[PDB]
């Protein structure tokens, strides 16, 4: 076949990753173990640990933009509420 | 020329054969690797080695007789070969230096030298051999948490942590008289039949073997030791065979011998064979086969071991072997079965009747402990011609069809797909 350019991942056998020695893997086959292990304990506990770990990264931006949105909405409401003759004109321009 | 057995305290058996003229007498203890806990592994190895060194040095210097041994899973086949006219001396030495006394043998110096020698031997076995290593790993991964997965050699951590007391404790808990026999394969007739039972020629430690709490089990697993440094590859499938003393030993042996061995670098093997060998030979896929169906008193293993050279083409070799096993359990030609019967006949004839008395003695000991009585090959030939296609169909419908497999290999296995590309394709969805 027509040779192609250099590639960072080979196929099986010549996969290209660093050669290693002494690493041992295992398995127990799907049929010899219960499919649903932990199901609830891991569910609740890991779910709460994960939600605790990254809470602030989603809390802070949401709070900031919610504060902006609330302030903008309230000022817009005040603008067109018995204020179209004394405040609307001086800020529209 | 007929095997004789009895029961007078210690079982004595004899397979007279005036064809050869190398008389052999020894013991076959019904315990070994299977009869011992994981934490103290190489105790049997250490026993065998201390014997095979110092007792050898004693016997050759004193008299003429070369002593061997063997441990497979539950034997200590301390066979002591001799001349036809020199069996009394061999028996006297065996009963004066193996059962008792053990003080002149287990000196600290000899024990320590043998300990370091055993360490070196097991180490270079780990660093050099490969098919035996993957076979041992296959046993260790098929029988997790069971007194059969531990190897017949042991682990360095388990080897180092035992000095004298553990060895003597195992001696006194397994070198009894209840599960120990005497085997006299060679060209002796009845001198061994009467001289074993004498005024004092008897094993010490009367009692019984401590029964194991759990015997055996099975579960699918993998133990791969992927290292690209080694040149070739190594894999070993496995499916749970049939234990000894069952009406399935010979049918399983035939179901294994159908596909047969293969050596890709021999002019007299590529040309012959059956479908998988041709379909492999069209390209270059594999380099060796070994269909083996090993059986033990607790459970047996039907295996398939290869050591290929191509690395990218593992998947195709596995896929073809699996489809051929499915073909075995779906439909077999009558000529295939007849050829298998003939081949297995000649193979048994060679194995059981090899001129070397030690092999026959070890096999006789194994059978007499497990079966309770020797099965002369005449009955085997009589009952082997009755094996028919329906029987093999039925047996493969149980042992093979959608049954958990265990594989374990060291080398460049990386190309091998993990589990669901070698397991869920034993039926090919069209039976
Ligand atoms: C909808 C929006 C929310 C879901 C977003 C998408 C979730 C998704 O893609 O599926 C994930 C899927 C579980 O994830 P997974 O892929 O198993 O776990 C991988 C995790 O990354 C690793 O997580 P883990 O292993 O730590 O634990 C995960 C755990 C955590 O999951 C939870 O418990 C939920 C936590 C998040 C939600 C919290 C409240 C909000 O998940 C479960 O509890 C698995 C539920 C398994 C149900 C068992 C069903 C058995 C067969 C039933 C047969 C019925 C037959 C019917 C008739 C025919 O979520 C669910 O199935 C939970 C919802 C259903 C609950 C029903 C009770
Ligand atoms: C809208 C219309 C419907 C959209 C359909 C789009 C397709 C479905 C996509 C589902 C999806 O993103 O699954 C991710 C999948 C997240 O689990 P995964 O599959 O391990 O995903 C990796 C994430 O980076 C997991 O991140 P992590 O490991 O850092 O843990 C944080 C995780 C933990 O989330 C929590 O805070 C637990 C309660 C969340 C509700 O937060 C989530 O990923 C929540 C995403 C769903 C809410 O959804 C779940 O939250 C399933 C339960 C685990
Ligand atoms: C997405 C791809 C998912 C399927 C790939 C897959 O399972 O690969 C594993 C397996 C790997 O192939 P292999 O290991 O070389 O085959 C050895 C067996 O002899 C493979 O078994 P085989 O030789 O019987 O395969 C030929 C034929 C494949 O069925 C057909 O599609 C021919 C009709 O097998 C059947 O499954 C036929 C019986 C089921 C008929 C169901 C009709 C539903 C409509 O491939 C299949 O099982 C192919 C199934 C194709 C079914 C339709 C796929 C549609 C894809 C879109
Ligand atoms: C409709 C409203 C429903 C509200 C509740 C939603 C589900 C919340 C589940 C939380 C269960 C309590 C905390 C875990 C306790 C626990 O783990 O108890 C033990 C079991 C599972 O433990 P395990 O064997 O998987 O641990 C595996 C390793 N030992 O749990 C249950 O079988 C809960 C059954 C009730 C549901
Ligand atoms: C009418 C039209 C339909 C006809 C259907 C015919 C069914 C049999 C098809 C060939 C099978 C066969 O040939 O199986 C008989 C031989 C017997 O090999 P063996 O058992 O001696 O191997 C010894 C161990 N058992 O298998 C083979 O050679 C296999 C060759 C490779 C497989 C190729 C299959 C491709 C066609 C599949 C068609 C499936 C539908
Ligand atoms: C990328 C495409 C992503 C979308 C593709 C979704 C449809 C393809 C799924 C094929 C799975 C398969 O063909 O599975 C084949 C497996 C085989 O078992 P096995 O593979 O271990 O045998 C491998 C070696 N013998 O049997 C099953 O699963 C049976 C369950 C099939 C469920 C089909 C559900 C159809 C949903 C259609 C959704 C709309 C499309």
In this complex, is the C-beta atom of A18 within 8 Å of any C-beta atom belonging to chain B? no
CA distance linking residue B387 with residue B396, whole number of Å:
13
Resolution in A: 3.2
Cβ neighbours, 10 Å, residue B191: 15
Pick the closest to residue B52 from B121, B6, B1 (CA basis): B121
CA distance linking residue B53 with residue B110, whole number of Å:
9
CA neighbours closer than 13 Å in the CB half-sphere of residue B324: 22
Q: Rounded to the nearest 5°, which phi and psi values hold at B81?
A: -70, 160
Cα separations (Å) of B9 from A88, B135, B308?
117, 37, 51
Q: Which two tokens stand for residue A79?
A: 């603008």
CA distance linking residue B357 with residue B303, whole number of Å:
28
Cα angle for residues B21, B24, B27 (degrees, 5° grid): 165
Question: Considering only CB atoms, which chain A residues are within 8 Å of B414?
Answer: 12-13, 15
CA distance linking residue B135 with residue B218, whole number of Å:
16
What is the least distance, in Å, from the CA of A31 to any CA of chain B?
8
Pick the closest to residue B316 from B276, B266, B346, B364 (CA basis): B276
Q: Which two tokens stand for residue B52?
A: 């095979």
What is the least distance, in Å, from the CA of A1 to any CA of chain B?
17
Pick the closest to residue B403 from B223, B279, B240, B277 (CA basis): B240
Residue A53, exposed/middle/buried by CB under 10 A (0-12, 13-18, 19+)? Answer: exposed
Pick the closest to residue B179 from B14, B360, B35 (CA basis): B35
Question: Considering only CB atoms, which chain B residues are within 8 Å of A19?
Answer: 227-229
B418 neighbors B222 (Cβ within 8 angstroms): yes
Q: Name residues contacting ligand 6 (CB within 6 A).
A: B 420, 424-425
Domain regions of chain A by residue span: 1-93
**Alpha helix ranges (H) inside B98-222:** 108-128, 131-142, 156-160, 165-174, 191-195
Question: Considering only CB atoms, which chain B residues are within 8 Å of A27?
Answer: 220-222, 418-419
**Alpha helix ranges (H) inside B129-164:** 131-142, 156-160
Determine how β-strand B235-240 pairs with β-strand B11-14.
Answer: unpaired
Look-up of token digits 């030495």: B93
B270 neighbors B286 (Cβ within 8 angstroms): no
Pick the closest to residue B146 from B338, B406, B426 (CA basis): B406
Q: Name residues contacting ligand 2 (CB within 6 A).
A: A 47, 50-51, 54
CA distance linking residue B391 with residue B398, whole number of Å:
11
Q: Which of A41, A45, A48, A49 for mutating ligand 4's site (highest number of atoms within 8 Å of CB)?
A: A41
3-state secondary structure at position B73: coil
- E strand residue ranges, B199-307: 221-222, 235-240, 262-263, 288-294, 301-306
Q: Which of residues 22-51 of A touch B (CB under 8 A)?
A: 22-32
Contacts of B207 (CB under 8 A, 6+ apart): B176, B177, B178
Q: Which of B254, B262, B327 for mutating ligand 5's site (highest number of atoms within 8 Å of CB)?
A: B327
In this complex, is the C-beta atom of B410 within 8 Å of any C-beta atom belonging to chain A? no
To probe the interface with B, which of A11, A12, A17, A19 has the most B CB atoms within 10 Å?
A12
Cα B271 to ligand 5 centre (Å)? 21
Cα A93 to ligand 6 centre (Å)? 64
Q: How far is CA B112 from the centre of its chain?
A: 29
3-state secondary structure at position B321: helix
Pick the closest to residue B363 from B309, B353, B347, B333 (CA basis): B353
């Amino acid at each position: 076949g027509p040779p192609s350019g250099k590639t960072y991942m080979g196929w099986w056998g010549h996969m290209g990753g660093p050669k290693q020695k002494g690493i041992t893997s295992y398995a127990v086959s799907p049929y010899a173990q219960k499919p649903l292990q932990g199901i609830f304990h891991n569910a609740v506990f890991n779910s709460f640990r994960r939600f605790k770990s990254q809470f602030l990264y989603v809390l802070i931006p949401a709070g900031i933009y919610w504060y902006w949105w609330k302030n903008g909405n309230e000022y817009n409401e005040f603008l067109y509420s018995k204020a179209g003759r004394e405040e609307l004109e001086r800020v529209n321009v | 020329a007929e095997v004789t057995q009895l029961s007078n305290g210690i079982v004595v058996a004899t397979e007279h054969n005036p064809s050869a003229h190398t008389a052999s007498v020894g013991v076959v203890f019904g315990s070994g690797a299977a009869n011992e806990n994981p934490y103290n592994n190489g105790v049997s190895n250490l026993w065998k080695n201390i014997f095979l060194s110092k007792e050898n040095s004693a016997v050759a210097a004193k008299e003429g007789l070369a002593l061997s041994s063997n441990i497979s899973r539950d034997f200590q086949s301390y066979i002591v070969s001799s001349l036809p006219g020199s069996t009394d001396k061999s028996l006297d030495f065996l009963n004066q230096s193996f059962i008792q006394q053990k003080a002149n043998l287990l000196s600290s110096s000899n024990f320590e030298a043998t300990k370091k020698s055993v360490l070196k031997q097991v180490q270079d076995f780990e660093e050099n051999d490969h098919p035996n290593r993957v076979l041992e790993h296959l046993h260790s991964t098929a029988f997790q948490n069971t007194p059969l997965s531990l190897p017949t050699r042991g682990t360095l951590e388990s080897l180092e942590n035992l000095v004298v007391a553990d060895l003597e404790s195992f001696a006194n808990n397994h070198f009894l008289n209840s599960n120990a026999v005497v085997v006299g394969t060679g060209n002796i007739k009845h001198e061994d039949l009467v001289n074993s039972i004498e005024s004092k020629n008897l094993s010490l430690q009367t009692g019984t073997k401590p029964v194991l709490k759990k015997k055996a089990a099975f579960l699918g697993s993998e133990v791969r030791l992927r290292d690209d440094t080694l040149p070739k590859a190594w894999i070993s499938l496995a499916v749970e065979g049939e234990p000894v003393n069952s009406p399935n030993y010979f049918v399983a042996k035939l179901a294994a011998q159908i596909f047969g061995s293969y050596n890709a670098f021999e002019p007299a093997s590529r040309l012959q064979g059956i479908k998988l060998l041709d379909n492999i030979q069209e390209y270059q896929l594999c380099d060796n086969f070994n269909h083996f169906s090993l059986s033990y008193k607790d459970s047996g293993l039907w295996g398939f071991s290869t050591a290929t050279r191509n690395v990218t083409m593992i998947d195709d070799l596995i896929h073809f072997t699996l489809k051929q096993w499915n073909r075995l359990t779906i439909s077999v030609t009558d000529t295939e079965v007849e050829r298998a019967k003939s081949l297995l006949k000649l193979q048994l004839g060679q194995l059981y009747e090899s001129g070397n008395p030690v092999n026959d003695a070890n096999l006789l000991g194994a059978e007499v402990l497990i079966k309770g009585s020797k099965l002369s090959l005449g009955e085997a030939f009589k009952k082997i011609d009755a094996i028919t296609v329906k029987d093999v169909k039925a047996w493969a419908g149980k042992r093979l069809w959608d049954q958990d497999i265990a594989i374990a290999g060291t080398g460049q296995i990386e190309g091998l797909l993990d589990y669901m590309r070698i397991r869920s394709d034993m039926s090919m969805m069209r039976w």
